[PDB]
Structure formats: structure tokens, C-alpha cells
Write a protein that binds this ligand. Sequence first.
Ligand SMILES: NC(=O)c1ccc[n+]([C@@H]2O[C@H](COP(=O)([O-])OP(=O)(O)OC[C@H]3O[C@@H](n4cnc5c(N)ncnc54)[C@H](O)[C@@H]3O)[C@@H](O)[C@H]2O)c1
Ligand SMILES: NC(=O)c1ccc[n+]([C@@H]2O[C@H](COP(=O)([O-])OP(=O)(O)OC[C@H]3O[C@@H](n4cnc5c(N)ncnc54)[C@H](O)[C@@H]3O)[C@@H](O)[C@H]2O)c1
Ligand SMILES: NC(=O)c1ccc[n+]([C@@H]2O[C@H](COP(=O)([O-])OP(=O)(O)OC[C@H]3O[C@@H](n4cnc5c(N)ncnc54)[C@H](O)[C@@H]3O)[C@@H](O)[C@H]2O)c1
Ligand SMILES: NC(=O)c1ccc[n+]([C@@H]2O[C@H](COP(=O)([O-])OP(=O)(O)OC[C@H]3O[C@@H](n4cnc5c(N)ncnc54)[C@H](O)[C@@H]3O)[C@@H](O)[C@H]2O)c1
Ligand SMILES: Oc1cc(Cl)ccc1Oc1ccc(Cl)cc1Cl
Ligand SMILES: Oc1cc(Cl)ccc1Oc1ccc(Cl)cc1Cl
Ligand SMILES: Oc1cc(Cl)ccc1Oc1ccc(Cl)cc1Cl
Ligand SMILES: Oc1cc(Cl)ccc1Oc1ccc(Cl)cc1Cl
Lengths: 288, 286, 288, 286
Amino acid sequence: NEDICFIAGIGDTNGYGWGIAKELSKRNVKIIFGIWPPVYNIFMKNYKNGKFDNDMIIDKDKKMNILDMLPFDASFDTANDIDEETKNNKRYNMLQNYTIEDVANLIHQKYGKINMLVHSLANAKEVQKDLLNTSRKGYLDALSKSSYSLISLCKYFVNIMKPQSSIISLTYHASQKVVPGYGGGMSSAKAALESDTRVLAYHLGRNYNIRINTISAGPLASRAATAINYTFIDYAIEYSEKYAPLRQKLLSTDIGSVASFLLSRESRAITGQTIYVDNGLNIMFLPD
Amino acid sequence: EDICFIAGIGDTNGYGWGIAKELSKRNVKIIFGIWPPVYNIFMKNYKNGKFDNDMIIDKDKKMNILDMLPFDASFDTANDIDEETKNNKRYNMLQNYTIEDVANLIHQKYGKINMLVHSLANAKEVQKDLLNTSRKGYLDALSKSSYSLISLCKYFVNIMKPQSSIISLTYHASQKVVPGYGGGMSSAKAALESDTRVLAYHLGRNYNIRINTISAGPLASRAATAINTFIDYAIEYSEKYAPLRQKLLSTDIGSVASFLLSRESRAITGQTIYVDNGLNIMFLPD
Amino acid sequence: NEDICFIAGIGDTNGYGWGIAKELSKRNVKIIFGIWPPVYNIFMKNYKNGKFDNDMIIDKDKKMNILDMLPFDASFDTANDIDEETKNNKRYNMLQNYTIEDVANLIHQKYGKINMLVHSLANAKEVQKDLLNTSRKGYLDALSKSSYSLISLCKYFVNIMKPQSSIISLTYHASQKVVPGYGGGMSSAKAALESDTRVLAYHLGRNYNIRINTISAGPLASRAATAINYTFIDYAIEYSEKYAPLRQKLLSTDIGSVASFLLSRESRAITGQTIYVDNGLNIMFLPD
Amino acid sequence: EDICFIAGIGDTNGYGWGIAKELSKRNVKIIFGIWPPVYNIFMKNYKNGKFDNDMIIDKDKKMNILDMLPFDASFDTANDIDEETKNNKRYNMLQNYTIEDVANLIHQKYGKINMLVHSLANAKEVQKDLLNTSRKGYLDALSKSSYSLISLCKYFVNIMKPQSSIISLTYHASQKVVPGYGGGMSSAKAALESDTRVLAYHLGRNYNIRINTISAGPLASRAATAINTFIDYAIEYSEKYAPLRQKLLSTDIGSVASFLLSRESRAITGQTIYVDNGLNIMFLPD
Ligand SMILES: NC(=O)c1ccc[n+]([C@@H]2O[C@H](COP(=O)([O-])OP(=O)(O)OC[C@H]3O[C@@H](n4cnc5c(N)ncnc54)[C@H](O)[C@@H]3O)[C@@H](O)[C@H]2O)c1
Ligand SMILES: NC(=O)c1ccc[n+]([C@@H]2O[C@H](COP(=O)([O-])OP(=O)(O)OC[C@H]3O[C@@H](n4cnc5c(N)ncnc54)[C@H](O)[C@@H]3O)[C@@H](O)[C@H]2O)c1
Ligand SMILES: NC(=O)c1ccc[n+]([C@@H]2O[C@H](COP(=O)([O-])OP(=O)(O)OC[C@H]3O[C@@H](n4cnc5c(N)ncnc54)[C@H](O)[C@@H]3O)[C@@H](O)[C@H]2O)c1
Ligand SMILES: NC(=O)c1ccc[n+]([C@@H]2O[C@H](COP(=O)([O-])OP(=O)(O)OC[C@H]3O[C@@H](n4cnc5c(N)ncnc54)[C@H](O)[C@@H]3O)[C@@H](O)[C@H]2O)c1
Ligand SMILES: Oc1cc(Cl)ccc1Oc1ccc(Cl)cc1Cl
Ligand SMILES: Oc1cc(Cl)ccc1Oc1ccc(Cl)cc1Cl
Ligand SMILES: Oc1cc(Cl)ccc1Oc1ccc(Cl)cc1Cl
Ligand SMILES: Oc1cc(Cl)ccc1Oc1ccc(Cl)cc1Cl
């Protein structure tokens, strides 16, 4: 009764956010999407035109139920943070209550307290550049949008969450081992995120009895994954399917069912952890 | 039908039982492997109803135990048992309790299984610090606590379905110093965690079978009381300093095991997963 | 002949920068100090008034030789990055060539190419706040000054360094395990720094044959260490001296002699590494 | 005067020799512990001047070797040698080669030492994958490659000065899967790295003695050629993909060992230090 999850970072059905929504929907969790304003209207129109109907089919006995879909920008902590330019920009002008604080307030006002929170977003202006060639501003952009946004989400959402709630984010192994092409300070951002997951786990655990973990996912041909540049993601997938201990296609719903477990009471003694869902690729040193 | 063999249950106070309870919730059939020295007292307590309250899952269900078999992880095959054991009071009345014999017996009675739990450890010199542990004591720890996992996998893969899943239990003393966790137990756990990776590679590639290990926080089990109030200290420190200040239950480990043993976790393998209320993340007590 | 080291982050004789200078000076490496403008004039006056004379004594057979002392602010990559306000500020107005690019240029013009580089600096406006309570701006400040500054230093100094040169920075274990009181995103910054050390090691190793490592140091009662708030550092030191495998006072020159090794040819097969110099405290789980 | 015992030199092509060379540079007196099966061929090659070119440090200096003694890390004390070894062709002509006997002999001839190097490993089933390794094969790997370090420490601390330093060599297969590194060698290295921490605690607190381990990249030593062209592949892959694309030399490991064994590193203990041209940091070949 009333397992409600906010998923921050869905723009289509091709990423981990959607796989997570599907698996949770399967367990009858109510789902609220937080959608970035640059893609929000296109997502809504597609949704309304039934473009996602096939993708919403669970077992053909069940179909996903989505409780709400809200414009959301993890760049802005409160309304006072929004620069006049953004506020007035073509894609933002007609939207409201999309900062982290406002969206938590809106969710609370409409549905009461929630018990599950998903951070499924990242961004970096200079992702295409190697770390050495990343500018101060590009690096800080990657940290701001990909890492600090988690801390802020936690800060504002803990107020609208029940004790024993659970929070997850997504990370990538480039934080711990070198992945050429994962540029722009994304590796730095993921390293910060994994460390912040531990520190937040301490504070949230002690003060709120709330858990936080992160899933280190293997490669998935999402929309963001193309932004990296056959392309970077095509090589990653090919390499993973050839060399992982489990040689099988990694699905967004593989991450989804792990997410679902971490967000449930079944994982109540797990917190502060980086959990690898990557067909075991992370354990390998030397290829065959 | 799901069937899980759980090697290392002696009573209802350890992690093996909590894992059994949680799997039972999900309608998994459970087979216990019981160390022969305690096999007859276990059967007696069970028959006398000592475990009845511990078997209740809820209003609806009671634990279904498919079978309970003697199992000694010291011995790979029938040929490995020495005379002194053959002659032992608690062994002479039992049979087919080597790792291979148990695999063959389960397969013959019940067919193929799809879940395997290693929940056992031993070290005859656990009360000595590592520096004062003898070669025989150290190798005993590795033999009983680490190699037993490899042997379990070796003999059991033949009786397991593709997409089966295996777990063991470990402890953070492998990675950081726990004074008191002596006799090469820290060594054995480090080997277990590394072996979990290497086995994940061979089992995943050859059989599409997953293997992970759960690094559990402290629980006042029978084996824990043999370390030297060590466990009293560990539990008190964990409950005081862990990010989550709730009592760690065997079923907290059990529900994670159940997930790792299910298809829900089909993309996780070779991993050490911490189920310890977050204690492992702390650097210094606040 | 001509082992020259630039040490970025010395403001007095109480920190790791000074211990590193001493140990290198011991091996006859020439030392150039990069001194932050807020403390630069006070450092120079103290130096000129002989206040550091005792602290410069090596074995009483030898005394430290300092080749140069340059104003340096790791906040600014190039002259074009300096805001008009800073440029005109009381402490900056009378200084020149203190951005990362300008200082590399100046060093090159005066002394030619160098072969050793030390990043011994960190800053975070909100260090006193817990991570959960750190603002976006405070967090980005910590990353900018403590982590990105390393990348930028590398980017500009690789041009004035010889092949087979070596770079080190300093980090702290709070990046990997939770240290309450290490706030403001300093833990996040150190996690980024350790990850960036690997990524830089790849690029610098492959393109320049230059090594980079970081030293994870135990507690030292430096000036910065008081900024954290008996205080945070007093407890850290007390705890380290009581519980480390080696129960002995950790000296800045203990870090210095490790730094010196990492910067020398003796460590030519080590790169991308986080090296712990902390009397072994990091290996402990449970106290006695 | 500094004196270092180096256990595990068989010829001039391994890490033991490179460590000996580098310590010699710093005027450390060197004592070799040589596995009895190869002790007589080593002495013969040495006398015949086979190693003369390898002993040159430079224009100035030649390696000073204080002594060369038979040493078998399989045996803790005289009582541990079985008859079959006593009767063996290559052992019967040698004596005082157990770990305790060597410590006693060195102490009696030369007094206290202050540097100790464990540079040895063995595993009779190295060519089998972990899953197919027998209990006896696995325990042999742990016995010879891991427990030998604990025993070395146990017997040698008595003959060492306070502020002494100990190192061993390990390999990244303990932490990440290297197909080919079989027979429980990966297991033994994981135990070695964990044991390095636990020993650092006991040795640091009780004796103020430091212990670290160097995780080395691949070198075409004698033992390396026994793994199954494995080493040819490892070296080629390392030289192609490591951040530093220079040939890894035994003396690259030797200069790190020398530093860790000196007072320069007085604040480092319980650590695994990677000396591998940075290869360990890479996630996937570019
Ligand atoms: N795709 C992979 O292969 C892969 C591998 C490891 C980790 N991950 C992680 O998974 C997460 C999801 O990425 P994905 O691969 O599903 O791509 P995706 O495009 O499906 O997810 C990213 C989403 O975040 C949203 N977003 C971007 N900036 C935002 C902002 N400022 N505020 C609010 N929303 C914003 C975008 O609209 C986008 O829909 C990422 O954090 C990524 O780091 C992905
Ligand atoms: N209890 C804790 O605090 C704790 C913390 C971390 C990990 N663990 C791990 O969990 C696992 C279960 O232990 P536990 O804590 O439940 O104690 P337990 O006594 O409940 O379980 C250990 C069982 O192993 C069995 N056993 C011992 N030697 C055997 C052999 N040669 N062959 C077959 N069985 C043998 C014993 O009969 C015993 O029942 C162990 O591997 C332990 O290392 C326990
Ligand atoms: N002190 C400790 O206990 C300790 C423990 C672990 C790591 N460290 C690390 O060692 C390094 C040195 O710190 P410390 O403890 O010696 O304190 P410190 O005060 O001696 O060193 C910090 C110096 O950096 C300089 N600095 C600050 N911001 C700067 C900027 N924008 N540009 C140029 N210089 C700037 C300051 O002038 C200061 O002198 C730090 O990076 C710290 O993270 C210190
Ligand atoms: N060569 C590599 O690529 C490499 C990479 C990482 C680590 N290492 C480690 O470096 C160490 C040295 O090995 P190496 O590569 O120089 O090969 P090596 O053959 O030069 O050295 C191994 C030595 O150990 C000795 N030995 C074997 N069993 C013994 C016993 N029971 N008692 C005493 N001595 C025994 C052998 O005589 C041999 O001389 C090993 O521990 C190895 O694990 C080597
Ligand atoms: O983290 C990721 C890892 C992989 Cl392998 C693929 C995609 C990922 O996700 C991103 C990568 C870069 C940027 Cl700018 C934004 C996002 Cl969402
Ligand atoms: O690994 C453990 C860790 C803890 Cl904190 C408590 C009990 C544990 O389990 C054991 C410890 C020592 C031995 Cl000899 C046997 C077992 Cl089953
Ligand atoms: O990193 C550190 C770790 C410790 Cl234990 C003590 C001091 C440290 O150094 C700093 C800590 C915070 C800030 Cl704002 C600046 C600096 Cl130089
Ligand atoms: O550990 C090693 C790692 C590598 Cl890459 C190469 C050689 C090594 O050394 C050994 C490997 C196996 C055995 Cl049986 C004995 C030794 Cl000395």
C-alpha cells in the first residue's frame, strides 16, 4: 500500500530510468517521472500519442502504470537559483515547480510522503574531451549536474520521505579504473558520487533511518550514451558481451530488478554501497 | 520448482537458518547439509520440536524442509576420510557425507537443483593471532573455509541447472584488520572473496552459473561465541557506530541471499555484497 | 644536476608542503615555492626576517636551499580567468604572473624545464558543514580548488617538464571511508582527485612518459587542518597515535621522504597510484 | 650495517635478484635463501662466473653477497621434514634449511638483521584452473606461497632489530581475474595481501616492525615460464596497454623494495604497492 517512487532522469524508453520504472511497476510501486525541460514536451507528446505503449507492456498480462510526470531540472536547488535567462527560455517559460525543492514540495502536496527515490541522470558539457583537456567550467558542470544533484535531491527529499526509505543512483566503473573516452570529468563526477554515497549513507542512516546505495551499471545503448561519440557505446557493449563472465545482452530491466531490490525492505541492511550490475565485467583484469 | 542446498546449518542461531527462512518465503525447497559431529543432536532437537517457533514464516506459512543430510566439507570423496574419523563416535553411524557423496545423493533423490549456499567456516586455531598460527592450523582454516567452496562448486555444478546461482558468506576482516579474528580466518576469507571472482569467470563462461559472496556483519551464532565476548564487542560496536542502528538479523542476510539466488540478480556475479548496516563504510568511530 | 621541483601550496612551515621541501632539499633538488596571494607577503616578510631559519635546518650540517618563491593561485588557469575584483584586490593588486599558465611560463623563462611537480593544496568554503548541508556553490568551490586545480596544473606544466618527470598530490582517506567532520565536499574532492590521478596517469604516461601519483597522508596539525574546527585535527592525531599499527608521531617529513621517492627515478614503474603514508591506520577496521 | 635476507633466488632472472642488486647499491649486505632442489646448480653457476655480468652495479661497485644458504619454505622446523625429502638426492647433502634453522644460522653467523624479503611462490597445480584444482594442490599453493610469509615473520622477528622492515611480492590476480593464473595461486596471493595487513598490525604494535607487499607486473622469470607463453602474453599486453610503455625490469621492482626496506618509508605499513607501469589502473584496452 503506497510504495511511491520518484525517478529523476527519464527522457524516453531507451535508458536505465525506464528499465527501473518497469521493474518497480511490476511490483506495484507507483511511479512519478521527473523529466528534464529540454525533452519534457516531446516526451509528453510521444506518451500521449501512444508511442510508448509497446514499451509499457510488462508481461502482456500487466502494463506499466505511471502516477505522474513532472518537469524537473536537477541543476536548480530552489526557485531562487534559476537565472532569468533559463526562466524565460523557450523550453522553460511555460513550466513551473521544476527545481529540486519545488518538485519535492509539489509531490508532497499531491501524494504525501514517498518511500523510494531514484537519481538516474548525468550531464557534462565536455564529455567528448579527455580529462586533461577539460576546462574548469566543463569539469564543474559535470560535478554540478552529475554528483551535486544527488546531494541536493537527498537534502530536499528526506523531508518528504518516510523513515526506512531508500535512495539509489547510477554510476559507472570509469570512477575506479581508466576508461578512455569517458571524458569531460564524468569519471571524476562518478568517483565523487560513489564517495558521496557513503557519506550520505552515514548522515541519512543516523538522522533519518534512510538508506542510500548506487548501482554501477554496465553499458546500455541509451540516448545519453551516444553523446559520448561504431561509437564509444558500441565498442563498450561489444567488449562487455565478449569478455564478461556472463556473455548475454545487458538489459535496462536487469538494472531495474536490482534497483527494485535495493529500494525495497528486502535490502534493509545494505547502505552506502556501490553495487555492480554489469554481468561481472568489473572483476576481469586480462581478456582472453 | 526451486531447490536450494544449504551447507552449514547446526541450529537456528546462524546465517544458514536465516537464509533458509527467507528462501522458504519464496517457496524454495530447502535441503540442509549438517556437520556430522552435530547431525544427531540437530535431528533430536528438530524431532523434539525445539525449532518449531523458529520455522514459522508467518500466519500463512511454515518452513518446508525437504531433507537434512550429514555433510562434512573437510572431505571431497569417500577416499578422503581418515581412519580416526571412520572410527569416530559421531561419524561411524553416518554415511555418504563427503562433498561428492552429498551431491550424488541429492541428485539421486531429488534431481537437479538451482541454488547453492556455502554457510560454513572452521579454523582449529581461531583463538591465536595470525603470527602465532601454525602451518597445520592455517591450512585447516583455508581447507575448511575456502577450499570447501571450490570443491562444493566442482561437485555440484554437475547437478545444477544452467542459470543456477551460488553464494557464500564472508567477513570484512579479509580486507581490514580485526584483532581477534585469528587462526587464518582472515586469510581464508580473503581467499574466499578472490576465489568468488575466479569461480564467477569459469562458472559464468562454462555453465552460465553465477556466484557471489555476502560480507555479513556480526551475529551471535554458535561459531561466533568461539572467537576470543569478541562477538559481544563486535555487535555492540556495530549497533553503536553503523550508519543504521538497528539490530542485524540473520533474516537481513537471508533476504539478500534470496535475491542473489533468484533470477532478479541475473546481471550480478563475482561480487562481495556487504550486508552489515553499512558499518564497512566508516573510517573512525564518531 | 638540475632536479627542479615546483611545490604549489606552501604558506608556512607547519604543513606537508614544507616537509616535502625539506626532504627534497636534502637530496639536492632545487625548490620553487608557489605561494597563495592571501598569505604571500606575510610568508615573504617572515622569511626575510629569519623566522624560518630554524625550520630550514636539515641535519645542522645542511640547511634548505630555496631557489625561488612565486605568488600562485590555483583558482585561475590563465590571466583571462582572473575577475576584475580579484585583479584589483588589496592582496592581489601588486602581484603578477600568478595564474597556473603564467607561473609555468615564468618558471620556464627563468629556469628552463623542470622534472618534479607537487600539488600540496586544497580549499573548500563550507568545510565546516556536513556534506548533506553543503550548498551547490560550496561543493563546486571544493572541487574547483582542490581537484580541478591538479588537472590544470598538469595541463600547463607538462609543457615545461622533461619526459620521465613525476607529479604528486596529497589526499585523505575520507574519500574512501566516512570521516565525520571532513565536510564541505572535501571528501568528494579527494575522491575526484584520486580517480583523476588514474586518468591523468594514463594520458600523461602515454603522451609524455610522465608519472602521477597521490599520497594519502595521515593527520598533521597544519594551519589548514585547524580550519576544520580539542578540535577535529586534535582528535584525528590522538586517534591515529593510539590506534595505528605504528604508534609514533606522524611528521611532515615522513610524507616528505615518500614524496621524494615518488618524484625520483627510483619509482619509475609506479603511476596512477594512491600511496598511504599514515602509519598504517587505513588498514584497521575495529579498534582495540 | 644493514643486512637483508632474501628468500627465493634461483638464478638472476627473477625479482629476488633485482631486489638484491638495488639493495647492494645502497651498501646493504645480502644473504640469499635458495630452494634446495636448485641450491647446488646455483652455487655451480655462481662459481663458474655465470652471474658475473649480472652482479655489476656500475663502474664503482659489484654486488657484495654475504652468504648463500639452502632454504625451504615448506618446512618450519627440523621436525617438519618427511623421510622422502630427507632421502632426496638434492636434499641429503644439505642441512639446516628449514625456516627456523635458517633464522638461527644467520643469527649465529652474522647477528641481528634489519631487512627481510619474501620472494617466492609455488603451487603444484598452477596449470589447472581454480575449479579443477585439488584440495592438496590448493593447500600446497597456500602453504608455500602465503603461510611461508607468516612463518618467515614468526622465526625472523627474534633475529631482527626494532624498526626493521619486511616485504613480499604479490600479483593483481588476487584482486581481478587472470585466466591462466591457476592452482590456487590467485587465492594464495589474496591471502598474502590480507595477511600483510594483519601482520602489519601485530608486528607494528609489538615490535615496531613494518611489512608491505609489492604487486609486480610481469617479468620473464623461471617460475613465470611454468604458467600456461602465459608470460609472453602478459608482457606483450602490459607493454602495449600500460600507461608507461617501457620494459618492466626486475630492478624497477628492486628500487621500490629498497625504499620500502629503508627508513625513508617509516610511515608506510600493511600496504600493497603496485609496481607495474600503472597497468592495474586500466579498465579496458584502448
Ligand atoms: N547508459 C549506460 O551505458 C550507463 C552505464 C553506467 C551508468 N549509467 C548511468 O545511468 C544514468 C542514466 O543514464 P542513461 O544511460 O539511462 O541515459 P538516459 O539519457 O536514459 O538518462 C539520462 C537522463 O537524465 C536527464 N537529465 C540530464 N540532465 C538533467 C538535469 N539537469 N536535470 C534533470 N534531468 C536531467 C536526461 O533528460 C536524460 O533523460 C546516468 O547517470 C549514467 O551515468 C549509464
Ligand atoms: N556470525 C557472524 O558474525 C558472521 C559475520 C560474517 C560472516 N559470517 C559467516 O557466516 C557463515 C555461517 O556461520 P555462522 O555465523 O552462521 O555460525 P554457525 O555456527 O551458525 O554456522 C557455521 C556452521 O558451519 C558448520 N561447519 C563447521 N565445520 C564444518 C565442516 N568441516 N563441514 C561442514 N560444516 C562445518 C558448523 O556445523 C556450523 O553449523 C560462516 O562462514 C561465517 O564465516 C558470520
Ligand atoms: N594536514 C593534514 O592532516 C592532511 C591529511 C591528509 C591530506 N592532507 C593534504 O595535504 C595538502 C596540504 O595541506 P596541509 O595539511 O599541509 O595544510 P597547509 O595549509 O600546510 O597547505 C595548504 C596550502 O595550500 C595553499 N592554498 C590554498 N588555496 C590555494 C589556491 N587557490 N591556490 C594556491 N594555493 C592555495 C594555502 O596557502 C596553504 O598554504 C592538502 O591538499 C591536504 O588535503 C593534509
Ligand atoms: N615474474 C612475474 O611476472 C611476477 C609478477 C608478480 C609477482 N611475482 C612474484 O615475485 C616472486 C618471485 O618470483 P619470480 O617471478 O622472481 O620467479 P623466480 O623463479 O625468479 O623466483 C621464485 C623462487 O622461489 C623459489 N621457491 C619455490 N618454492 C620454494 C620453497 N618451497 N622454498 C623456498 N623457495 C622456493 C624458487 O627456487 C624460485 O627461485 C614470486 O612470489 C611471484 O609470485 C612475479
Ligand atoms: O555514465 C554513463 C556510462 C556509459 Cl558506459 C554510458 C552512458 C552513461 O551516461 C552518461 C554519460 C555521459 C553523459 Cl554526459 C551523460 C550520461 Cl547520462
Ligand atoms: O566469520 C565469522 C565472523 C564473525 Cl564476526 C563471527 C563468526 C564468524 O564465523 C566463524 C568464525 C570463526 C570460525 Cl572458526 C568459524 C566460523 Cl563459522
Ligand atoms: O585534507 C586534509 C585532511 C586532514 Cl586530516 C587535515 C587537513 C587537510 O587539509 C585540508 C582540509 C580542509 C581544507 Cl578546506 C583545506 C585543507 Cl589543505
Ligand atoms: O606470481 C607470479 C605472477 C606472474 Cl605474472 C608470473 C610469475 C609469478 O610467479 C609465480 C607464479 C606461479 C608459481 Cl607456481 C610460482 C611463482 Cl614464483
